[PDB]
Structure formats: structure tokens, C-alpha cells
Amino acid sequence: YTQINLYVSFFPMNYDTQSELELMLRNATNDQNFSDYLGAVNNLYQIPAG
């Protein structure tokens, strides 16, 4: 590897629409929650040959 960068993108929201949106998302009842799509626990059990 020679050089490796990180590319994000800022959506140009209006600053008055911004300060309403961040003030609702700083609140503890509006916590962003996510979930794994696979949703499983890997367990690889050894089977010998034959």
C-alpha cells in the first residue's frame, strides 16, 4: 500500500434546519439503533475425514 485516504461527504444542510435536527438527536430518547442482518453466532465443529 502506498497511500490510503478516507472519503466522507457532508450534506449541505441549512444551519437553522441543522440546529433543530441535532437538538433532537442529542436527546436520550432518540438514540440511533441498528441490527445485524445476518444475526447469528458462528460455531465451526470439527468433523474428521471419513
Binding site: 460455531n43 465451526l44 465443529y45 470439527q46
Partner: protein, 367 residues
């Protein structure tokens, strides 16, 4: 019989090193390179009843090869199983129970011998001492079957004690060949069949004590400048023994090879016993059976009453025409004796009547 032991899952570790080496103890599987196995072990077993394919297998250290009924085929211009030694080896070589085949089937017996066919052998020992070829089957070789070369040694170290016993040679153009200075070894009870030359003798002092040569054109060849001399060539030659052998049907009957041979210098007419060398003496000749087998005594060392060729206790038995006839040079009539013999009525070319006891055969002259 069902293996219901419980198992825990693997813990995403790097697994420890598992190896499965030492799968042959000393054996040699088909389709495996033999040069890396002959280097490692001293005794190499083979798979019983296998089917191999070898070509130019270089052997430097003396090993033993138990064949166990294996079959080694080949294809190409190289020999099988090249055995190159040094002077300093205390161990010996024993090649045993292998059926060597060639790159032929019902071989081209009308093709003349040339430089192209000289490397079509199966065992070519360069200077390895104490080899042993025991219970083998050599079929369909356009060149020699074996060839025992020997380089220049000194100090009366005549040792090199080789054995070639219990072998079966079919269709080989030349049977047991031997280079110069390959002295004092035995080659007996080898059942020849359909060969052009059973012994391309260059080195002397051998011992041939029971070989059978049925339907073979020549059995004992010794000229000047043959094929298969090697380094250290035609020197101190043709001193061996030849006792109790069998050379029936060499000229009449079921013989299939032509008479011309095409030596590297000239062409010659083969016989059942062809001998032409002014510097070499004659082997001992006892107990041999000849049915329809020619003999050509051309030249030996009778110069200062130094050699006398004596046929003793042998069968001659050639009736029709000149089949099985004995031919001598007219300058060699006083030195070819036949004392003790049985014959049908065989043509003797240039042999006096008083020199043969008992009185058998027809005496003619070939000027």
C-alpha cells in the same frame, strides 16, 4: 462404530502444525521420482505387481531393489537405470525380481545395428563393483540388455565380482554385453530366446555355466572393434569359461534374425560361435550342446604355439547340407582339436582327420 464423542467449536486460533510425513517406510510408489528415493535409503522395496515407467535413473550409491514382481517400462533414447559408481563403495547392488520391458513389441529384427540403437539398454553399470541381477525378465531391447563397462584400474585389483543368474531374455538384439576390463564375474542359467547375440564378449575371464540359447543367431561374439566396448576398451580379452551351455538351432530350424550384423567398422556373417581376434586366446569349451549351430574359428593367438582350441565333450549334430558346420581358417588347421564329441554327420571345414577323436562328421575344405 458410530463415534458419538462430543466436540467443542474451534476458537479461531492459528492451528498448530500437523504433518503427515514418513508415509513410505522404505517403499517406492508408482509415479514417484526414484532418484530422490535411491539417494535416501539402502534397501528400496517396490509395490507388488505394479506398473512403473523409468528413464535414465541415475544411481550413485549402492542400493538394493526388491522388485516383488514389478514391471518397469520405458520410452526414449536413454537407458533405464544408469548405475555410476566410484572405487570406494563397501556395499553392493542387488537388482531382483523385476520385469524390464522395452520400447518395442515383437522387435524390428530386420533393422540394422547402428549408433542410434546403442543406448537402448536397461542396466548400464559404469564402474560399480559387486552388482547382482537375479530373477529378471528382459524383453524387446533394440540394443543391449545389460552392459558392464569398466574404466582403467591398476594394481591387479580384479575383484568386481558380478552375478547374472536366473534371467529370461526374449527379443533382445544383444544379451549380456560387457565392456573391456570387466573381469572375473559369472553369468549362468540365463534362458535366452530369439536373440541375435547372446554374449557380446569384450572383457575376459568370465564364467558361463548353464545358459540356454534357443532360436538365437549368435551366442559368443568376439571380433576386433565390436559395439559396446566403453572406456578402457578391447584389452586382455576373451579368457572366460563356457561350460555346459545350450545353443541349439542357430542356423537351421526356428531362427529368425539375419546373418549380417554391421559392426562399426565393417559387416560380418554371424555364426553360433564367431571368434576373430589375433591377440586373444580361446575359452574353455566343455559340455555344450549344439543342434544346427555354426562355429567360425577365424583367428586366435597360435603365434608361438601359445594357444590350442579344443572342443571337449560336446554335441555337434548338423545333417542337412552345411547347417551347424564348423569353419576354421586353413592357417589354423593344426591348432583346432576336437577330443571327445558326438555328432550326426556334420561338415568340418579345414579340420584334419587325425585331430578329431572319435571320427565323426564330414571333412571338407573351404579355400
Amino acid at each position: 462404530v458410530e463415534e458419538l464423542y462430543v466436540i467443542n467449536p474451534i476458537n479461531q486460533w492459528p492451528a498448530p502444525g500437523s504433518f503427515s510425513s514418513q508415509k513410505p517406510p522404505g517403499t517406492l510408489l508408482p509415479g514417484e521420482d526414484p532418484e530422490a528415493v535411491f539417494k535416501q535409503y539402502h534397501v528400496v522395496y517396490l509395490v507388488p505387481g505394479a506398473q512403473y515407467h523409468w528413464k535414465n535413473i541415475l544411481i550413485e550409491k549402492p542400493v538394493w531393489i526388491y522388485g516383488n514382481g514389478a514391471t518397469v517400462r520405458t520410452s526414449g533414447t536413454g537407458p533405464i537405470l544408469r548405475i555410476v559408481g566410484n572405487r570406494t563403495e563397501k556395499r553392493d547392488v542387488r537388482i531382483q525380481d523385476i520385469s524390464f520391458f522395452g520400447e518395442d513389441c515383437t522387435p524390428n529384427r530386420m533393422e540394422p545395428m547402428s549408433e542410434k540403437l546403442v543406448y537402448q539398454m536397461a542396466i548400464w553399470v559404469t564402474d560399480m563393483k559387486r552388482v547382482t541381477i537375479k530373477g529378471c525378465n528382459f524383453t524387446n531391447f533394440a540394443g543391449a540388455a545389460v552392459f558392464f563397462e569398466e574404466t582403467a584400474y591398476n594394481g591387479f585389483f580384479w575383484s568386481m565380482q558380478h552375478l547374472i543368474t536366473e534371467c529370461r531374455f526374449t527379443g533382445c538384439r544383444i544379451g549380456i554385453a560387457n565392456g573391456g576390463r570387466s573381469e572375473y564375474s559369472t553369468a549362468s542359467f540365463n534362458n535366452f530366446f530369439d536373440c541375435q547375440i547372446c554374449f557380446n564378449v569384450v572383457g575376459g575371464n568370465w564364467n558361463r555355466c548353464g545358459n540356454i540359447a534357443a532360436n538365437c543367431r549368435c551366442v559368443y561374439l568376439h571380433t576386433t572393434n565390436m559395439w559396446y566396448e566403453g572406456a578402457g576398451g578391447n584389452f586382455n580379452a576373451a579368457h572366460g569359461s563356457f561350460t555346459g551351455n545350450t545353443m541349439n538351432h542357430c542356423d537351421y530350424g526356428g531362427n529368425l534374425w539375419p546373418t549380417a550384423f554391421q559392426l562399426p567398422d565393417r559387416e560380418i556373417q554371424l555364426a553360433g560361435f564367431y571368434f576373430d581376434n589375433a591377440r586373444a586366446r580361446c575359452p574353455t569349451w566343455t559340455g555344450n550342446t549344439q543342434y544346427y549351430g555354426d562355429m567360425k574359428i577365424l583367428n586366435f593367438n597360435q603365434a608361438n604355439d601359445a594357444a590350442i582350441f579344443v572342443i571337449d565333450g560336446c554335441a555337434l549334430y548338423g545333417q542337412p547340407g552345411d547347417t551347424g558346420s564348423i569353419e576354421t581358417t586353413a592357417a589354423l588347421t593344426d591348432k583346432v582339436f576336437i577330443q571327445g564329441c558326438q555328432g550326426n554327420k556334420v561338415t568340418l571345414f579345414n579340420i584334419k582327420a587325425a585331430n578329431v577323436v572319435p571320427a565323426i562328421g564330414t571333412i571338407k575344405q573351404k579355400p
